[PDB]
Each structure stands twice: as C-alpha cells, then as structure tokens.
Structure 1
Amino acid sequence: AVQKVVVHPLVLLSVVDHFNRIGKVGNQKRVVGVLLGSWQKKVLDVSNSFAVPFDEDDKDDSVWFLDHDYLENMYGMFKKVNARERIVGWYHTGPKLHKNDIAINELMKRYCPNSVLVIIDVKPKDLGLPTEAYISVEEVHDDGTPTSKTFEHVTSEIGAEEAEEVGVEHLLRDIKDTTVGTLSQRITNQVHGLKGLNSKLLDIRSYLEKVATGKLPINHQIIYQLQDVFNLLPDVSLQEFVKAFYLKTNDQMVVVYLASLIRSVVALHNLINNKIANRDAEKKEG
C-alpha cells in the first residue's frame, strides 16, 4: 500500500527538544505528538510536527487523553501558515512499543486514512537506523481473535532536502568519514554491517529463550520463516561454485594487475618531473 517513508532531520530533531521540555517530570512520560506531512507518488513524506499534552497512569493503563482543541487550532494555524502542509498521522517517542498504541491510531484515524505512526529514539545506541515506523492492518483471520489488528513495519529512512542539507552539514562540524575511496565501504559496511548481522542473529537467539522455560505461546506463525532460513541457507562448496569462483578471481585481479602496473609508470614520470626541477636550478640559482 505504502512504498516507504521519508523523514526530514527537522522532525527528527523536533521531538528531541520536546523530550527535553518534558524531561523535568522525571518519573515517566512518553512524548506523543501529531505528525504532519504530505504523502505523494505513493511515497510517505514527513515534514513538521509538534507534541500534544499527554499523560498516563500505570494502574489501568487504558486511559489516554488527546486535547483535540489543541489539535484543532494549532493544525488550523498550521493549515493557515502552510496550506501545502497537512496531517500525515502521528508519532510517539517509542522506546519499547507501549500498549496504548493500538487505539491511539484508531482514535485519530478520522483525520488521516492511513494514519501512520513513527517510533523514534531518544537514547541512541544501535548499528542500524534508529527510526521505526509501522502501518495499521486488521484481520478477521487465522487463529487469534475475531477482532485482530497488528502493526506491520514499512521500511524507513531519513530523507534529505536542499534547504536542510545546508543546515545539518553546518551543524555537524565533527568527526567525519568523508573521502569515499577504497576505505569508506570497508568501515560503513565491512567493519560495521558484519557486526550489524550480529544483533539479528542474536535477536532470534532472544526469541529462542522459550524452549521449555519462557513464555507460554509457542510458535505457530514464527517458525515458517525459520524453517526456510536453514532451507535457503546457500549452496555448499563442491560444484563449479568452486570453479567459477577461481574463474572470476582470474579475471577481476587482471584488471587490478593492469591498473597497478599503470600506477608505477605514472609516478616514475613524476620522478623525472622532480629531477628536471632539481638539477636545472642548482647551477642557475645556487
């Protein structure tokens, strides 16, 4: 239904400052706010946000509040001050997918049809992309309940823009990994993404904690993929997968062998370009 989402770094930042402004409560508060944006060409866009007053008490945690007058007038100001801008859905600060977010989405779907949510990070530590988004799908289906509804993650990335790329690249001024040569790939995804595969091997190790001791629902629809992964584990090293591998090493290295051969001759022509400027000035200048 939706291809992907596009998040600007402003709305990425426009939650953190509110997380600072309610950080004096100390005890517990999740930041929940209205997400504004304009989805076009089946691509979800996210532009602007604010945060709505929201509290939560732990005993009987089914009692939420959205001050809709604050939602009515401030969006009416925002529809005034940017008529290109509209509602796109909502968000919450999302540490660990709290329970009220099954009907918050159903509370305010009378504005946005595909009222998408966004889970963000306030304490960043990962090896992935710390912005997560779901979508609302419902089912009268296989086994669980007559009324069943579960969120599904549509893929997420941080979109840039020519206005804000001026800003963020001025705001970094920090340790950087520019000059992409032979080394940026080695550290953006060869040092890093191999350890990125750690926390996904270890993630399914964490579901594996129920062998005879963990939580009481057992499998039914979790193991059809896990049965496939050991089935779609790749081909063993006996076939011409051995032979055609040596074939292309015997082709890819020849281009490197030519290209390195050129590198020696070019700097040797540079060597004479310094022996023309060494000997032809010691008699001239002194």
Structure 2
Amino acid sequence: AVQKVVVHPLVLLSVVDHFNRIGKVGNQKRVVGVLLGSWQKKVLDVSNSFAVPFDEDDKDDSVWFLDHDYLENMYGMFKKVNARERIVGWYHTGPKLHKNDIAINELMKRYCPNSVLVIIDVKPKDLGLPTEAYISVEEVHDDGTPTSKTFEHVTSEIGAEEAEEVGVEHLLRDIKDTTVGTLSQRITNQVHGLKGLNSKLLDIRSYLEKVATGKLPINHQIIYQLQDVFNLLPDVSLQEFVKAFYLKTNDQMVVVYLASLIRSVVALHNLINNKIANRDAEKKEG
C-alpha cells in the first residue's frame, strides 16, 4: 500500500494560504481541499493541490459536502496543463480529525483506488515536522468486529526537487547554513532529545489519563502488548553490556589518537610557517 509520503512546501502553503482565504472571513471548523499526488512508486510524492469551499455542521456533526464540479473541471484544468498530476486524496487542517472525516474518503474512493488524507497545521507550534498523513485502509480488528476503518498513520517527510528548492532556500535568510559539524549536530541533540522527552511525557500522560478518564475501552487492546514492548528492554548490565563499555572505549581510542595526530600536523605547519613569515617581515622591514 502506501508507506511514506513526500510533502513539499508548496502543498502545505497551498492549504495555509487558503486558511488566509477563509480565515479573513473566518470562522470555525477547518480548511479542506483536494490533494493532488504523484505516484512514481510505493513511496508517494506530492507536488500541487487545490482547495474547495467546505462547511460542516455540528448538529449533525456528521454532515459534510464538497463541490464535485470544482473537483471535476479543475482536475480537467490541472490535468490539462500538467498530465503528470492527479488527485491522490484530500486534506484538512485538523488539528485533530473528528470521526466524520472517514466518509469523505469513502466518497472519493471512486476517483482514486486508495485516497490518503493529509492532516495539516496552519500555525506551527509543536512538536516537530508539521501536518500528518493517514491512509484509508480496512484493518478489521483482532476482536473480529464488523470491518471498520481506523486510518493508519503514514510517516510524512518534507522534500523538494529543483525550483521548489530555489524559492525556499533563498527565502530562509535567517540562520547559518549549515554549519556542518559544529552547531548542527548539537542543536539536533537538544531538539530531538528534549522534544523526545516531552513527546513521551505528554504521551505517557495520555496513557494514564485515558485509563483515569475516557474508559471504555480503553485498554483494551494494544495497551497490554504495547506496554510490555516498553518492558522488553530495561536494559542494563551485567554482563555483555559491560564488555560493550570498554569496547566503546577502545572505539574512541583510534579517533582521538587521530585527533592528536591532526593537532601535531596543524600546529607544525601553521606555527612554523607563520613564525617564518612573521620574523621575516619584522626583520626585513625593521
């Protein structure tokens, strides 16, 4: 099926600028549009998209509709100008999908064999790479219930090709690039580490909160198996983990030995040559 999707900055902005379109008039609900995907292989890619006016009542929180004439002739517009582009699904700005979002995909399954819905985020806050990806699939259940659709999460990544790189790479004008080797890896050690702390923290806060409030199910199903997967590896020594310690010490040997070698070479060349050209410039001019 669909493993991972490539979300370019162009489609994300194409939702967010429409969040300015209906956002200046407001008010509630979300920005929904039709997603134009490009499938070269099992890995999915996204290039363009277009948004359609959408309203959803709360009464009746399950009522939703889109304009098919807009989806039809504009697809005829975008397929005309670009024959490689076709609709792989739809999208919305969330932030969290209400249970009614399933039937939208079930309606457009006539257009595409598998429609992947992309939740997006117009205002960056947390925790990381924005948006989200959900693919329409029927997993049934291990409990043998009548088949129901719980959308499986698709990992989303940001990328570009050529011209879409040109625009944004000039538009940054913000932080140093990269710089490779010094600030890069250590700031990533802060972000990936600390955002990994509050991720599982708030996620384990939901683990206990769902047991405290929100039952049923809730708990079951995956709770006992997933939590035991957390209890798979504690994981400490003795024994072989002690061997990995001084083996890792034996690994840092070579690299730091080489470090002292570069120290001697850099100090030799630079210091000797600089003092030469220094003492020479002083004794000749003075």
- Assess if the C-alpha contact under 8 Å between 2:54 and 2:65 holds in 1: yes
Cα drift, residue 225 of structure 1: 3.3
C-alpha distance after superposition, 1:34-87 (max 9, x if no partner): 111221121111111111111122111122121111111111111111111111
- Assess if the C-alpha contact under 8 Å between 1:8 and 1:160 holds in 2: yes
Go from structure 1 to structure 2 and tell me whether the alpha carbon gap of 1:158 and 1:214 turns closer, same or farther (over 3 Å shift): same
- Assess if the C-alpha contact under 8 Å between 2:5 and 2:46 holds in 1: yes
Cα drift, residue 184 of structure 1: 1.5
C-alpha separation between the residues in 2 aligned to 1:194 and 1:49?
A: 34
C-alpha distance after superposition, 1:156-177 (max 9, x if no partner): 1012212211111111111245
The normalised TM-score by structure 2 is 0.92
Go from structure 1 to structure 2 and tell me whether the alpha carbon gap of 1:257 and 1:205 turns closer, same or farther (over 3 Å shift): same
Report the structure, 1 or 2, having the larger helix content.
2
Cα drift, residue 145 of structure 1: 4.3
Go from structure 1 to structure 2 and tell me whether the alpha carbon gap of 1:144 and 1:57 turns closer, same or farther (over 3 Å shift): farther
Runs of at least 5 residues in structure 2 that lack an aligned partner in the other structure: none
Runs of at least 5 residues in structure 1 that lack an aligned partner in the other structure: none
C-alpha distance after superposition, 1:250-270 (max 9, x if no partner): 332342133224313422321
C-alpha separation between the residues in 1 aligned to 2:142 and 2:266?
A: 69
Go from structure 1 to structure 2 and tell me whether the alpha carbon gap of 1:227 and 1:93 turns closer, same or farther (over 3 Å shift): closer
- Assess if the C-alpha contact under 8 Å between 2:79 and 2:85 holds in 1: yes
C-alpha distance after superposition, 1:80-101 (max 9, x if no partner): 1111111111111121112321
Report the RMSD for the aligned CA atoms in angstroms: 2.0
After TM superposition, the structure 1 stretch with the greater mean CA deviation from structure 2, 182-191 or 117-126, is: 182-191
**Partner of 2:246 in structure 1?**
246
Structure 1: which 4+ aligned runs deviate by more than 6 Å? Answer: none
Go from structure 1 to structure 2 and tell me whether the alpha carbon gap of 1:59 and 1:188 turns closer, same or farther (over 3 Å shift): same
C-alpha separation between the residues in 2 aligned to 1:211 and 1:29?
A: 29
- Aligned: 1:54 with 2:54: yes
C-alpha distance after superposition, 1:200-250 (max 9, x if no partner): 232122131144544332312121333323431243221031133112213
- Assess if the C-alpha contact under 8 Å between 1:128 and 1:196 holds in 2: no
C-alpha separation between the residues in 1 aligned to 2:98 and 2:214?
A: 21
Cα drift, residue 141 of structure 1: 4.2
- Assess if the C-alpha contact under 8 Å between 2:211 and 2:219 holds in 1: no
Cα drift, residue 188 of structure 1: 1.2
C-alpha separation between the residues in 2 aligned to 1:271 and 1:94?
A: 61
- Assess if the C-alpha contact under 8 Å between 1:8 and 1:159 holds in 2: yes
C-alpha separation between the residues in 2 aligned to 1:186 and 1:68?
A: 50
Go from structure 1 to structure 2 and tell me whether the alpha carbon gap of 1:283 and 1:207 turns closer, same or farther (over 3 Å shift): closer
Go from structure 1 to structure 2 and tell me whether the alpha carbon gap of 1:35 and 1:69 turns closer, same or farther (over 3 Å shift): same
Go from structure 1 to structure 2 and tell me whether the alpha carbon gap of 1:191 and 1:276 turns closer, same or farther (over 3 Å shift): same
Number of corresponding residues: 286
C-alpha distance after superposition, 1:178-209 (max 9, x if no partner): 11104411211345334324312321221311
C-alpha separation between the residues in 1 aligned to 2:282 and 2:142?
A: 90
Cα drift, residue 146 of structure 1: 1.9
C-alpha distance after superposition, 1:4-36 (max 9, x if no partner): 111111111111110001112333131110111
C-alpha separation between the residues in 2 aligned to 1:40 and 1:116?
A: 15
Cα drift, residue 2 of structure 1: 1.7
After TM superposition, the structure 1 stretch with the greater mean CA deviation from structure 2, 19-28 or 71-80, is: 19-28
After TM superposition, the structure 1 stretch with the greater mean CA deviation from structure 2, 202-211 or 153-162, is: 202-211
After TM superposition, the structure 1 stretch with the greater mean CA deviation from structure 2, 68-77 or 201-210, is: 201-210
Go from structure 1 to structure 2 and tell me whether the alpha carbon gap of 1:103 and 1:168 turns closer, same or farther (over 3 Å shift): same
After TM superposition, the structure 1 stretch with the greater mean CA deviation from structure 2, 143-152 or 159-168, is: 143-152
C-alpha separation between the residues in 2 aligned to 1:115 and 1:184?
A: 37
- Assess if the C-alpha contact under 8 Å between 1:88 and 1:112 holds in 2: yes
Go from structure 1 to structure 2 and tell me whether the alpha carbon gap of 1:180 and 1:88 turns closer, same or farther (over 3 Å shift): same
Aligned partner of residue 33 in structure 2, secondary structure: strand
**Partner of 2:235 in structure 1?**
235
C-alpha separation between the residues in 1 aligned to 2:191 and 2:74?
A: 46
Go from structure 1 to structure 2 and tell me whether the alpha carbon gap of 1:219 and 1:124 turns closer, same or farther (over 3 Å shift): same
- Assess if the C-alpha contact under 8 Å between 1:127 and 1:196 holds in 2: no
Cα drift, residue 122 of structure 1: 1.1
Percent identity between the two aligned chains: 100
